[PDB]
Design a protein around this ligand. Structure first.
Ligand SMILES: CCCCCCCCCCCCCCC[C@@H](C(=O)OC[C@@H]1O[C@@H](O)[C@@H](O)[C@H](O)[C@@H]1O)[C@H](O)CCCCCCCCCCCCCCCCC[C@@H]1C[C@@H]1CCCCCCCCCCCCCCCC[C@@H](OC)[C@H](C)CCCCCCCCCCCCCC
Ligand SMILES: *[C@@H]1O[C@H](CO[C@@H]2O[C@@H](C)[C@@H](O)[C@@H](O)[C@@H]2O)[C@@H](O[C@@H]2O[C@H](CO)[C@@H](O[C@@H]3O[C@H](CO[C@H]4O[C@H](CO)[C@@H](O)[C@H](O)[C@@H]4O)[C@@H](O)[C@H](O[C@H]4O[C@H](CO)[C@@H](O)[C@H](O)[C@@H]4O)[C@@H]3O)[C@H](O)[C@H]2NC(C)=O)[C@H](O[C@@H]2O[C@@H](C)[C@@H](O)[C@@H](O)[C@@H]2O)[C@H]1NC(C)=O
Ligand SMILES: *[C@@H]1O[C@H](CO)[C@@H](O)[C@H](O)[C@H]1NC(C)=O
Ligand SMILES: [Cl-]
Lengths: 98, 281
């Protein structure tokens, strides 16, 4: 039928205060089929303490998942969400922009 | 009322080839997950202490059995008919079924199925309704399913008798969590917008529950109807995040404020004030 590429939105639980612990969310939505892989990234390295929701889908049958990790933003560190999917030739990287 | 009004189970079944299929499932109050399905065991994972509602363990066990049998048998039967329906692997089937409490108290039930991300069928009152997007496959499917003895009767009972009392009992059992009020945090940011001398102001609103929320850019009492709302995005802990943006001419940003209304604030709106005509002076 159809194939849809993931929308990828990265956002923090609380406003980003340097030094203050927080949560980093990656919301991957609007994709089809359900097969997907997602990593959260600290400075290019896959964060290993990552939780995610069970698979769900919206009114138009497109799938969505929430990935999240506690983190502590600094002015020097970079964070991102890495997604691969049949609609992507290479894993797409979406960096967090406070 | 405040929290969720709908209970529903969802199914995602992926068929890789003629012998391998995998099914994931879960149960939800609106967009709040209260059940998981464990394919390790063919039983349900209750995510909240109250997730069984007012049902006895016997009736829960029976429902788990019905779901376990359905999930295993669905994939088997699909595999067996995949040739007759001219199916090409891989393909993916989705379904959702449940009931929703409406204003005035009526509870409406539903069942919908998809193939390849497109509508395929629905149920109206133990009748299988093929969706036009499903084409002749869906017409053939609904003609076949009515011949499996007793399955439409099971569906009808679950949709129209079991679900509504489950929904009521679980909304009552869960009320301390489902009717809690959690106050948002709000903060402002700014960015360049596409276009000359323009500027995007952003009002962030984060951590609220329940989900209905009101947020607008304002000049005094004048709602700025150019306000644009993003998606309402989830946090892990049953709250959400939302941004409201406003494209404004550089030099016209002064006098703007962001106003948040939420049931948790007991009438005391959040008001953040943008200071300066441009970026940040
Ligand atoms: C048109 C309707 C759907 C079509 C059905 C598909 C064919 C299957 C073939 C037969 C399967 C094996 C045979 C016996 C099994 C049978 C049953 O009756 O049981 C026992 C019976 O006993 C007697 O009646 C016997 O006579 C009888 O033999 C039987 O044994 C099944 O249980 C049928 C009933 C199951 C469906 C549920 C009905 C709606 C329920 C609404 C709300 C429930 C009540 C609230 C209480 C819950 C309390 C919580 C508690 C914690 C627990 C559960 C918590 C956790 C649950 C999460 C995981 C569960 C996921 C499973 C279901 C999710 C959504 C429901 C299904 C959605 C329907 C769609 O899905 C894609 C359709 C499918 C669309 C299909 C689209 C594509 C189609 C195919 C395309 C072509 C390919 C080829 C196809 C050819 C055809 C195959
Ligand atoms: C889980 O909760 C369900 C609903 O939520 C609960 O409801 C009550 C009881 C409190 O516990 C709430 O705090 C809680 O939210 C239970 O389902 C409900 O059960 C009651 C019976 O206890 C039942 O009321 C009966 O209704 C019929 C009329 O129903 C028809 O008409 C109405 C419209 O008027 C329509 O909406 C219905 O769909 C039907 O078409 C009525 O005739 C009965 O009256 C008789 O009995 C009462 C005594 O209760 C007596 O005063 C009268 O004089 C008369 O003799 C009675 O009022 C509700 O309809 C039902 N609600 C739903 C949505 O089904 C559920 O109870 C279990 O299932 C029921 C169907 C019933 O078989 C009960 O015996 C069961 O225990 C409960 N438990 C489970 C396991 O689901
Ligand atoms: C289903 O159809 C019957 C008529 O056979 C009707 O009485 C009933 O209200 C309909 N809806 C149901 C059972 O949910
Ligand atoms: Cl601020």
């Amino acid at each position: 039928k159809i194939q849809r590429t993931p929308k990828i939105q990265v956002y923090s639980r609380h406003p980003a205060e340097n030094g203050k612990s927080n949560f980093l969310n990656c919301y991957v939505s609007g994709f089809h089929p359900s097969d997907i892989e997602v990593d959260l990234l600290k400075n290019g390295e896959r964060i290993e303490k990552v939780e995610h929701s069970d698979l769900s889908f919206s009114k138009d049958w497109s799938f969505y998942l929430l990935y999240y990790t506690e983190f502590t933003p600094t002015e020097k560190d970079e964070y991102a969400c890495r997604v691969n999917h049949v609609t992507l030739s290479q894993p797409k990287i979406v960096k967090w922009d406070r | 009322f405040q929290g969720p009004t709908s209970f529903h189970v969802i199914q995602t079944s992926s068929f890789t080839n003629s012998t391998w299929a995998q099914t994931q499932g879960s149960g939800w109050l609106d967009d709040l997950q209260i059940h998981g399905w464990d394919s390790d065991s063919g039983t349900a994972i209750f995510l909240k202490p109250w997730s069984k509602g007012n049902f006895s363990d016997k009736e829960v066990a029976e429902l788990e059995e019905i779901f376990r049998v359905y999930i295993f048998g669905f994939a088997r039967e699909v595999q067996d008919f995949a040739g007759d329906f001219q199916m090409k692997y891989p393909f993916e089937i989705q379904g959702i079924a449940g009931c929703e409490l409406h204003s005035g108290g009526a509870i409406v039930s539903f069942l919908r199925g998809a193939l390849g991300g497109l509508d395929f069928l629905s149920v109206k009152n133990a009748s299988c309704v093929p969706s036009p997007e499903g084409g002749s496959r869906a017409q053939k499917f609904c003609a076949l399913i009515i011949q499996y003895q007793g399955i439409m009767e099971t569906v009808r009972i679950l949709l129209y008798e079991t679900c509504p009392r489950y929904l009521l009992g679980v909304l009552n059992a869960g009320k301390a969590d489902l009717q809690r009020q959690v106050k948002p945090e709000a903060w402002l940011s700014s960015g360049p917008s596409p276009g000359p001398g323009r500027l995007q102001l952003v009002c962030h609103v984060s951590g609220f529950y329940p989900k209905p929320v009101w947020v607008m850019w304002m000049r005094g009492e004048q709602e700025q109807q150019g306000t644009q709302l993003g998606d309402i995005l989830p946090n892990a802990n049953w709250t959400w995040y939302l941004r409201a943006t406003l494209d404004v001419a550089d030099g016209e940003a002064a006098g703007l404020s962001c106003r948040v209304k939420h049931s948790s604030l007991e009438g005391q709106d959040i008001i953040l004030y943008w200071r300066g005509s441009g970026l940040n002076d």
